[PDB]
Amino acid sequence: LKKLCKLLKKLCKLAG
Amino acid sequence: LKKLCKLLKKLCKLAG
Amino acid sequence: LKKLCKLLKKLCKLAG
């Protein structure tokens, strides 16, 4: 999923 | 495994 | 996203 992969990416950015 | 769940929880905590 | 973390938390809880 491109949606699952976009959400994981935004979780990483918000956490960093 | 119990380590992965700990990192996923902390990622979310920081993300939030 | 809040649901992903929420689904990931349930996944980790059921597994432990």
Next chain:
Amino acid sequence: LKKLCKLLKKLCKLA
């Protein structure tokens, strides 16, 4: 929960 697990299964399988 189960759809996510298949998406994860599908992600690892697609890589």
Next chain:
Amino acid sequence: LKKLCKLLKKLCKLAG
């Protein structure tokens, strides 16, 4: 990486 895919698979297996 191959180790991540293995734990995710274990997390799901156990959680069901």
Next chain:
Amino acid sequence: LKKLCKLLKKLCKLAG
């Protein structure tokens, strides 16, 4: 945390 995110990015980049 940073390692997990780097791996997830790759999994997502390799997958598509």
